[PDB]
mmCIF file of C-alpha atoms and ligand atoms in Angstrom:
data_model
loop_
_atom_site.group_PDB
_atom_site.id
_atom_site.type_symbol
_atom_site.label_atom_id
_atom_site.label_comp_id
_atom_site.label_asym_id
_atom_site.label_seq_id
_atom_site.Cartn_x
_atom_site.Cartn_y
_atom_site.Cartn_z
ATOM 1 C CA UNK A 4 1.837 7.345 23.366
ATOM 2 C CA UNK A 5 5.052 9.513 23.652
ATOM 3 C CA UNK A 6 7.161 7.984 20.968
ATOM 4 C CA UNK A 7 5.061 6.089 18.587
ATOM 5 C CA UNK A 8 3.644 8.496 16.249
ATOM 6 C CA UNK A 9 0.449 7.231 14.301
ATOM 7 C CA UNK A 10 0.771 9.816 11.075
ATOM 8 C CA UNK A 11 -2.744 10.458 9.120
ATOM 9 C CA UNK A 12 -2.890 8.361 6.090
ATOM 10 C CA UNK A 13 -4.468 9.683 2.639
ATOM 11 C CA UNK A 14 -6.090 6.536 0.953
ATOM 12 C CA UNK A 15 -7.122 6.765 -2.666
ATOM 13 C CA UNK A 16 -7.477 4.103 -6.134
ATOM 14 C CA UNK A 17 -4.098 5.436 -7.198
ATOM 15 C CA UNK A 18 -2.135 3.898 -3.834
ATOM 16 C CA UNK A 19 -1.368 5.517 -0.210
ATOM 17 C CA UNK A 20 0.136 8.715 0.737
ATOM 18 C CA UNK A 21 1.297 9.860 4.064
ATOM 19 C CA UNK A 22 3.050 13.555 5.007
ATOM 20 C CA UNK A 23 5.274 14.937 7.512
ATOM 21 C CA UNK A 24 5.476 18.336 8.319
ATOM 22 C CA UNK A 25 7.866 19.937 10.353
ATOM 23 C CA UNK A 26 6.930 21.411 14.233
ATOM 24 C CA UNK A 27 3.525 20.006 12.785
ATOM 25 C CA UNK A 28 3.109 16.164 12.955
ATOM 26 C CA UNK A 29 6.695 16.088 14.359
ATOM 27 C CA UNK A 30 8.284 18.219 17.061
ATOM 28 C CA UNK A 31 11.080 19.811 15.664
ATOM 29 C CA UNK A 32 12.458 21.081 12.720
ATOM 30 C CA UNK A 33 14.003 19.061 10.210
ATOM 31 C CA UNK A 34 17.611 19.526 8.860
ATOM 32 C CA UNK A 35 18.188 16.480 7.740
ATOM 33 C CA UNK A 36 16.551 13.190 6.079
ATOM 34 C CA UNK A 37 18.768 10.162 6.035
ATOM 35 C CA UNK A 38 17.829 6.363 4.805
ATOM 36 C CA UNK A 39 18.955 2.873 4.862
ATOM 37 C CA UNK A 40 18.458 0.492 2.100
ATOM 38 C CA UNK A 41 19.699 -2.277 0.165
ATOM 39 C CA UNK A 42 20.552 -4.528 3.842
ATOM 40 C CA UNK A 43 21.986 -7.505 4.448
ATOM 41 C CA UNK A 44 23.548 -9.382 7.134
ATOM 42 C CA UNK A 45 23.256 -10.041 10.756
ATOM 43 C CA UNK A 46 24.910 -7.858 12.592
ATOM 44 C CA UNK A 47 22.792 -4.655 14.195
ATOM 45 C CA UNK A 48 22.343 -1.149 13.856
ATOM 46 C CA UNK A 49 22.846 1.748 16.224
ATOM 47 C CA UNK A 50 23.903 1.455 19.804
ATOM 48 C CA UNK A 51 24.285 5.224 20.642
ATOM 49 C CA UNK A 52 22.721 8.018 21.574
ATOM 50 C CA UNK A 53 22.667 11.265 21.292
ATOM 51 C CA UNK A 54 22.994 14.652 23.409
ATOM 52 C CA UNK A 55 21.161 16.973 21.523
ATOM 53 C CA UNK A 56 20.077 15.289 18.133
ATOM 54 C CA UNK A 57 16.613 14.421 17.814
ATOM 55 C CA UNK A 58 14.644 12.190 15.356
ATOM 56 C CA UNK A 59 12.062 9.850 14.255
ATOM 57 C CA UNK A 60 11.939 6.697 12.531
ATOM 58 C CA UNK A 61 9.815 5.400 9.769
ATOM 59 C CA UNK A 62 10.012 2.384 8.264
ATOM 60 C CA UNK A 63 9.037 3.281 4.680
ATOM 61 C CA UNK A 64 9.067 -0.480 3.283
ATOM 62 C CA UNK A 65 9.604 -4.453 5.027
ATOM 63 C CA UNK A 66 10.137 -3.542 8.604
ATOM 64 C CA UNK A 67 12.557 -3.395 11.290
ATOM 65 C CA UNK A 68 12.846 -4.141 14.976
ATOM 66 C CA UNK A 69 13.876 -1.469 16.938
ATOM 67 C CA UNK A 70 15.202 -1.003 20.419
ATOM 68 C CA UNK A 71 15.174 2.303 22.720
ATOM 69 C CA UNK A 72 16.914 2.935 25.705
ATOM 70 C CA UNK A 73 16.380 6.119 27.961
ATOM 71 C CA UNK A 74 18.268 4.850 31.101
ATOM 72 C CA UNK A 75 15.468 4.081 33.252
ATOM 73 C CA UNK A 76 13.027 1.574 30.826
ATOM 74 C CA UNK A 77 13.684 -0.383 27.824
ATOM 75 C CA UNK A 78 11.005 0.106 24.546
ATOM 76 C CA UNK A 79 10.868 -2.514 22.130
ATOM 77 C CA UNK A 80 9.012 -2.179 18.649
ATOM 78 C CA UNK A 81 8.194 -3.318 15.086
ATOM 79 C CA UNK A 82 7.738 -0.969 12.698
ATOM 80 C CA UNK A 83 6.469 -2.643 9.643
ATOM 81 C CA UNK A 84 3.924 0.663 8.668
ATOM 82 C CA UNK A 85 4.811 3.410 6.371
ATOM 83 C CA UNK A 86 2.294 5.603 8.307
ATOM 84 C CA UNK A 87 4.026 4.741 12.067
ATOM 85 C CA UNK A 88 6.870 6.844 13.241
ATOM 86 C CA UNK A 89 8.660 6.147 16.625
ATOM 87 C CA UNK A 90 10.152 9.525 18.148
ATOM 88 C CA UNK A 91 13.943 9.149 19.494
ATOM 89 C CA UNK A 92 14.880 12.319 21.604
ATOM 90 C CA UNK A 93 18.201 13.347 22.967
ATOM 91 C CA UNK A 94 19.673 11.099 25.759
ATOM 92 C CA UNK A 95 18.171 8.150 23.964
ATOM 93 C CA UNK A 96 20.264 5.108 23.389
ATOM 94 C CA UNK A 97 19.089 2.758 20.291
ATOM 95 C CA UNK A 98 19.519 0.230 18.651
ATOM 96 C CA UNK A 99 18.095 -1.313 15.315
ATOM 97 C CA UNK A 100 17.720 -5.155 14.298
ATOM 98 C CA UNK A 101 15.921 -7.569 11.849
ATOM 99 C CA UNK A 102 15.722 -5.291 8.820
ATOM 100 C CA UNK A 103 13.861 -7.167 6.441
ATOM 101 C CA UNK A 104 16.030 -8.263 2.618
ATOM 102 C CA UNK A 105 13.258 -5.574 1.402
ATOM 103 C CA UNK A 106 13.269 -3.119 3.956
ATOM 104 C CA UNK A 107 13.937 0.680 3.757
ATOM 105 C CA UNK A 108 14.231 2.634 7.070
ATOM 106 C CA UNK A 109 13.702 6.379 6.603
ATOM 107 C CA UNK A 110 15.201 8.851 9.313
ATOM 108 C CA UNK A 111 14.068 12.441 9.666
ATOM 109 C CA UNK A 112 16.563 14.417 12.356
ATOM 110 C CA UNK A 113 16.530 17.269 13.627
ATOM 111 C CA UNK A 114 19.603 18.573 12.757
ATOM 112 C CA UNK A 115 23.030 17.969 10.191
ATOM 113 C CA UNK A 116 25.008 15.046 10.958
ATOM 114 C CA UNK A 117 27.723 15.510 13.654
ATOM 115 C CA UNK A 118 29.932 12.848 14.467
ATOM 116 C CA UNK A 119 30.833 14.740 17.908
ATOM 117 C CA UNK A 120 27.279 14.401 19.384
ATOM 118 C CA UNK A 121 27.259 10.831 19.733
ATOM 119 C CA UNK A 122 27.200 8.565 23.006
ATOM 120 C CA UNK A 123 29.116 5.190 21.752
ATOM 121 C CA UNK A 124 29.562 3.822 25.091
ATOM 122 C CA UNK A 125 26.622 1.852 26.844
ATOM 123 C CA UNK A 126 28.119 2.829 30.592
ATOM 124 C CA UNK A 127 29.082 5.949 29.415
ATOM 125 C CA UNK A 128 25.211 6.839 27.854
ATOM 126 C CA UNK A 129 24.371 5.150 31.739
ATOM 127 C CA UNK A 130 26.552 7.872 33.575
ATOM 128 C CA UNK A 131 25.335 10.431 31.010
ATOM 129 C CA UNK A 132 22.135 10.153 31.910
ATOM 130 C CA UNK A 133 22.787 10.021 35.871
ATOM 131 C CA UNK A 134 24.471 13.073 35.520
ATOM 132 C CA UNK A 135 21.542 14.356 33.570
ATOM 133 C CA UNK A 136 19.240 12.854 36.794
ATOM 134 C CA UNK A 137 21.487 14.727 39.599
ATOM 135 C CA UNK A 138 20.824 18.167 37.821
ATOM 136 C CA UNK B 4 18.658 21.708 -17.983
ATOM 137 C CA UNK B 5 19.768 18.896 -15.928
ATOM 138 C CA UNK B 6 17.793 18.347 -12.312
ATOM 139 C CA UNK B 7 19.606 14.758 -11.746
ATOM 140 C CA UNK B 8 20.989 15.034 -8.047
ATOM 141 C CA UNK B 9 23.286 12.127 -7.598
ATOM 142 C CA UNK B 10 23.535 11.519 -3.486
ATOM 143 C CA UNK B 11 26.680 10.414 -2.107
ATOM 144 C CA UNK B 12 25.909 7.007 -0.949
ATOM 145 C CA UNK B 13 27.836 4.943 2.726
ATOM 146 C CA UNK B 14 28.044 1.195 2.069
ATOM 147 C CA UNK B 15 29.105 -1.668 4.366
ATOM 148 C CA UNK B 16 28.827 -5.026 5.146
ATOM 149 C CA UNK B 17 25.202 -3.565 6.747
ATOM 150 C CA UNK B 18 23.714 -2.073 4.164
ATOM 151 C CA UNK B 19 23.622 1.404 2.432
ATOM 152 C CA UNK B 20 23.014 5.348 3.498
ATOM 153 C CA UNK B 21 22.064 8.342 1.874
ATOM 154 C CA UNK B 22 21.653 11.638 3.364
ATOM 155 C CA UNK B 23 20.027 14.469 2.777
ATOM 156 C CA UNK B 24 20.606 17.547 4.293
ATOM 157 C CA UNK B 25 18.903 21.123 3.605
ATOM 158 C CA UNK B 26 20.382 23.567 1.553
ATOM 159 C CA UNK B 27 23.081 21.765 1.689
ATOM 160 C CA UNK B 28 22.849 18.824 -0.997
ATOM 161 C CA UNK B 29 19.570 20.304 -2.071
ATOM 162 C CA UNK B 30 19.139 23.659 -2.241
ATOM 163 C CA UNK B 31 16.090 24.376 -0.316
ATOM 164 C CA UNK B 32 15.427 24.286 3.592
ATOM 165 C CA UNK B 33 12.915 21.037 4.070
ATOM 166 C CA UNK B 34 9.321 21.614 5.588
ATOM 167 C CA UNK B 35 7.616 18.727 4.668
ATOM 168 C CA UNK B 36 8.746 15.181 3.712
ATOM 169 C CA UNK B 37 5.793 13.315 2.109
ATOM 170 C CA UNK B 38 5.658 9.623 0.483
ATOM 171 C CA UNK B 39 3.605 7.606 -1.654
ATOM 172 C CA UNK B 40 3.268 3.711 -1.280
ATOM 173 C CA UNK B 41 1.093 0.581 -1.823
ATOM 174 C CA UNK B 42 0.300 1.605 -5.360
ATOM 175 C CA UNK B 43 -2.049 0.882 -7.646
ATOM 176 C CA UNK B 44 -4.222 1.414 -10.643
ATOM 177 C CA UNK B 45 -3.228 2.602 -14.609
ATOM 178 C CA UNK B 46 -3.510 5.844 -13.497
ATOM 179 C CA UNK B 47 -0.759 8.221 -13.381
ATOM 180 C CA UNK B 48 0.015 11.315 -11.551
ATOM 181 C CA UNK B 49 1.313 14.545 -10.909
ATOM 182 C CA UNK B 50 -0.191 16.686 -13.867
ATOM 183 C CA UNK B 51 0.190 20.004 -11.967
ATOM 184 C CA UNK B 52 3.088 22.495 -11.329
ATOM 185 C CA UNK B 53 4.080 24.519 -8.201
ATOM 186 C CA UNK B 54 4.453 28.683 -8.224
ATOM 187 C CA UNK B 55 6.070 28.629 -4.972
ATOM 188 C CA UNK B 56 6.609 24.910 -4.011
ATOM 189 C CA UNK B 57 10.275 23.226 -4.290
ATOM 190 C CA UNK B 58 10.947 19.536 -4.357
ATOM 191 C CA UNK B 59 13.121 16.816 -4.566
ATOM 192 C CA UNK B 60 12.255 13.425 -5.263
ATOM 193 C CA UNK B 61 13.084 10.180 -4.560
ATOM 194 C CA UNK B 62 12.081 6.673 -5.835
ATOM 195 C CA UNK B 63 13.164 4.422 -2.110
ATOM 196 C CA UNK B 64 12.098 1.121 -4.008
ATOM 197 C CA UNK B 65 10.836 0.013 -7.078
ATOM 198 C CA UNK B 66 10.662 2.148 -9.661
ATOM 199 C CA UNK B 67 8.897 4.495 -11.677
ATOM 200 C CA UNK B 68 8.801 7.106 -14.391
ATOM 201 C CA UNK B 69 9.165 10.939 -14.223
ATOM 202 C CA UNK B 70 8.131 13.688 -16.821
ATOM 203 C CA UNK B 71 9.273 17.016 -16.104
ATOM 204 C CA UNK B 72 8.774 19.904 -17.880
ATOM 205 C CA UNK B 73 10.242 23.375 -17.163
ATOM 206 C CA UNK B 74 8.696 25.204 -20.050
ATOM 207 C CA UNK B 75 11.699 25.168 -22.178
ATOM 208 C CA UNK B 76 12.436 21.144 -22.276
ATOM 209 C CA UNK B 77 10.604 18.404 -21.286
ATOM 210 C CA UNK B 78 12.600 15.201 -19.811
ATOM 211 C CA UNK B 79 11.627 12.251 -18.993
ATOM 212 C CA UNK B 80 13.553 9.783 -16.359
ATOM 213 C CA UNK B 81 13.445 6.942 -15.012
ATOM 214 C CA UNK B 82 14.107 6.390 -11.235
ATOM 215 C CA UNK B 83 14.838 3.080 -9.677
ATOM 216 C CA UNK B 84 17.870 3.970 -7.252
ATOM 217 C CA UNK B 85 17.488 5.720 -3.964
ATOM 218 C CA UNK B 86 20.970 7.395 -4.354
ATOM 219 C CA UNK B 87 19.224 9.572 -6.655
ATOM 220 C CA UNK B 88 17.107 13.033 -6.617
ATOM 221 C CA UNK B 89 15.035 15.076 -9.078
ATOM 222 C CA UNK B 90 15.043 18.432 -8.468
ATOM 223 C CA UNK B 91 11.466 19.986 -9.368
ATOM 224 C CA UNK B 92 11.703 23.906 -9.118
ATOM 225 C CA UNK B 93 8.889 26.033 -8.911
ATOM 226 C CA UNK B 94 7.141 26.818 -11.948
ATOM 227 C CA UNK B 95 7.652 23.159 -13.165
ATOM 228 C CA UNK B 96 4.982 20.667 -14.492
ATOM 229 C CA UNK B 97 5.781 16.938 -13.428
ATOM 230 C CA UNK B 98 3.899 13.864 -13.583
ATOM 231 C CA UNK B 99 4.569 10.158 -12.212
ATOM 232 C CA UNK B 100 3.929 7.237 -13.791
ATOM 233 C CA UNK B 101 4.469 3.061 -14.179
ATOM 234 C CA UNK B 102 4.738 3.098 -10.412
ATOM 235 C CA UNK B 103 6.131 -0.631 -9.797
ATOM 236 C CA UNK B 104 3.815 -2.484 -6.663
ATOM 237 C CA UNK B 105 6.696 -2.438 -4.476
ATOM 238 C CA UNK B 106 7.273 1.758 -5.549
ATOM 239 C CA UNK B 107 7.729 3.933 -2.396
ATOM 240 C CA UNK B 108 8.319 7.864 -3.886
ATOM 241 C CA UNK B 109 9.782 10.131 -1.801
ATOM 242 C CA UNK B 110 9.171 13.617 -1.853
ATOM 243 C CA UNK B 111 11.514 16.807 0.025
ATOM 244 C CA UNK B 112 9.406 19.784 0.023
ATOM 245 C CA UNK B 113 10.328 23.186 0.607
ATOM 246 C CA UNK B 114 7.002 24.414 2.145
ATOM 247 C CA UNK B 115 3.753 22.965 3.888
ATOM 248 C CA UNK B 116 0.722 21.336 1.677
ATOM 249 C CA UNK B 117 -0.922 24.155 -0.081
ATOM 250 C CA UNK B 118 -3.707 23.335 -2.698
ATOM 251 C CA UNK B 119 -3.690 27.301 -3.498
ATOM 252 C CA UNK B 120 -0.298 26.501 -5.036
ATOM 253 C CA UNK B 121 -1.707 23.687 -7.884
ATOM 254 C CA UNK B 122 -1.283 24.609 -11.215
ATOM 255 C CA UNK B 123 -3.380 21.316 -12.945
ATOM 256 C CA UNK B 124 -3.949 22.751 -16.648
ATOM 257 C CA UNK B 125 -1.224 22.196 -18.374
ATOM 258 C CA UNK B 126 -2.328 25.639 -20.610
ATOM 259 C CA UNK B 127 -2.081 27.604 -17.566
ATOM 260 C CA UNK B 128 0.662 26.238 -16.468
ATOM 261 C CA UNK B 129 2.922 27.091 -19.760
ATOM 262 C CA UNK B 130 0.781 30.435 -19.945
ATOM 263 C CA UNK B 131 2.130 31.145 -16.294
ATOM 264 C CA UNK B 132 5.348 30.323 -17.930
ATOM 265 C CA UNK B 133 5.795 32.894 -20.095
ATOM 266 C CA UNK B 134 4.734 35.368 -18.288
ATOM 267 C CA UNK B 135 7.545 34.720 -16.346
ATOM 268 C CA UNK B 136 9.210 35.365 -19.387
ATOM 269 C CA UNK B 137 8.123 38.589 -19.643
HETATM 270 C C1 LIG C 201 23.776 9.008 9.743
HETATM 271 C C2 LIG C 201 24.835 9.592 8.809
HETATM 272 C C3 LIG C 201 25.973 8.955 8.665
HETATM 273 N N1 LIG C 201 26.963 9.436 7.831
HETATM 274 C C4 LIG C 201 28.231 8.746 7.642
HETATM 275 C C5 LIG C 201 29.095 8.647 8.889
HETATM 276 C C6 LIG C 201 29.932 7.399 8.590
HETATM 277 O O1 LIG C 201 31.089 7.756 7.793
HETATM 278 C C7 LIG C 201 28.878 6.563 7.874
HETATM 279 C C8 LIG C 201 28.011 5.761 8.770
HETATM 280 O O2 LIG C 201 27.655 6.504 9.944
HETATM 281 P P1 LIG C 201 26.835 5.549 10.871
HETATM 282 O O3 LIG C 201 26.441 4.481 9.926
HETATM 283 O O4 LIG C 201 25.715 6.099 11.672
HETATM 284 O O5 LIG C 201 27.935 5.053 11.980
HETATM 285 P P2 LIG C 201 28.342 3.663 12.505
HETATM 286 O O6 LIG C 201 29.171 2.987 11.436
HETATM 287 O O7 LIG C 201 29.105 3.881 13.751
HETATM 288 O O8 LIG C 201 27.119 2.875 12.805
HETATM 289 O O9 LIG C 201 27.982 7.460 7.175
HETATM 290 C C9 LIG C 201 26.811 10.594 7.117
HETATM 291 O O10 LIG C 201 27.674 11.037 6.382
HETATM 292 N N2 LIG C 201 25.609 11.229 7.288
HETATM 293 C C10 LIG C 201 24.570 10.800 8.104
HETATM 294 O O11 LIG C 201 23.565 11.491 8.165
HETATM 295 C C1 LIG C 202 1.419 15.906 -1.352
HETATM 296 C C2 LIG C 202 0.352 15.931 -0.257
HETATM 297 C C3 LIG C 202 -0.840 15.494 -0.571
HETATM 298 N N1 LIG C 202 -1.869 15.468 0.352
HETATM 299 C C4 LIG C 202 -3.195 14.951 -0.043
HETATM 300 C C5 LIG C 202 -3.916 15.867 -1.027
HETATM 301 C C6 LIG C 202 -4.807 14.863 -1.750
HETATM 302 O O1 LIG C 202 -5.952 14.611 -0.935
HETATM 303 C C7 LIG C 202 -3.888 13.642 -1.861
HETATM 304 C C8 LIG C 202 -3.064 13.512 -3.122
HETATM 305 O O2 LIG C 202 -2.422 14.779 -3.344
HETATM 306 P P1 LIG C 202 -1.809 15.148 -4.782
HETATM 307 O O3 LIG C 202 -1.522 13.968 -5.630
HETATM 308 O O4 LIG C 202 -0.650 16.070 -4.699
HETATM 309 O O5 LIG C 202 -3.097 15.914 -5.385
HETATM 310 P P2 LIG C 202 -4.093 15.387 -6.438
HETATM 311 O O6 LIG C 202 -4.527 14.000 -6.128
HETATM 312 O O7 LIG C 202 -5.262 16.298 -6.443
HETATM 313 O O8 LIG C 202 -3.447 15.360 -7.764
HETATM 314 O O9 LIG C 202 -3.013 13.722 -0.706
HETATM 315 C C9 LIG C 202 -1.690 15.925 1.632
HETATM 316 O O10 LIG C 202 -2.570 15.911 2.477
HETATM 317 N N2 LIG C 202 -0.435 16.398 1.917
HETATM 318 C C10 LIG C 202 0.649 16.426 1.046
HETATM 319 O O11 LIG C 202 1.707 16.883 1.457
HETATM 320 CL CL1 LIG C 203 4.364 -5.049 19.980
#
């Protein structure tokens, strides 16, 4: 509804084709595109969040379980669909599990990485956002 | 004229990372980031140039074969690794082809889908060309 974007899918005999346009099918600009690939293991993404940074997920191959966290509910999904993106604003905390052996996450944010705008501490993301609640 | 971009690539015990960042490892601000996936068919693609339009692009999985061709050279290249880019400038034919099934091709573009900006005759487009030239 709010987070899980359903992008519009071109279909054809050649294969499938799906585009994202910035401040168009996503709400901000984009700076950046980061991915994930090649995985292995069992131990988790994530588990941080972010002040200002925003972004959204697609899972461009296999799929991947992810978790968000905005201090008052917890979200759960599967993205397993080129075409599905799952919006993760500011003051989100997330986390991301089960990548499939064959599974390529894509990441479009809206701005240059920046180690200093990141919320590593699960209490600390909880008084960040109570803060955030009093004002 | 080489177009190879060869992204700096984070590995761990989790996995791998590339990132791209605008006009900063490519030299273009990003506006649109299109893919192509579940593939099929004999047919290739491509066949057109941009006049405006930049790209970059990126084979995620699989694999699949490149022609470019800027008017002076033509190259062809093979991408299978996500750690690498193919710069396609504007005024410069490229077509895709042997997608494998599991092929997911990633595109950075520097401007919004425009059909007004399709070159698709290869005549035209090395007739736009030299014009340039002149
Ligand atoms: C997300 C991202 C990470 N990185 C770097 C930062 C680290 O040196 C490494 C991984 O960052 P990241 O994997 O997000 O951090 P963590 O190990 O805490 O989960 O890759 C970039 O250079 N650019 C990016 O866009
Ligand atoms: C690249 C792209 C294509 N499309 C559409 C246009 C076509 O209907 C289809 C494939 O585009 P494309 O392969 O570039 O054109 P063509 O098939 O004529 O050679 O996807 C978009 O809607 N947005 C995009 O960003
Ligand atoms: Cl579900």
């Amino acid at each position: 509804e709010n987070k899980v974007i359903n992008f519009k899918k071109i279909i054809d005999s050649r294969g499938s084709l799906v585009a994202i346009e910035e401040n168009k099918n996503i709400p901000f600009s984009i700076k950046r595109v980061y991915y994930i690939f090649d995985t292995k293991g069992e131990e988790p993404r994530g588990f941080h969040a972010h002040k200002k940074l925003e972004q959204v997920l697609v899972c461009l191959n296999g799929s991947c379980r992810v978790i968000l966290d905005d201090g008052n509910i917890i979200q759960e999904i599967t993205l397993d669909s080129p075409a599905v993106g799952l919006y993760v604003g500011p003051a989100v905390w997330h986390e991301m599990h089960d990548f499939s052996s064959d599974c390529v996450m894509m990441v479009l944010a809206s701005d240059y990485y920046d180690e200093t705008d990141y919320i590593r501490q699960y209490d600390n993301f909880k008084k960040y956002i109570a803060k955030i609640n009093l004002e």
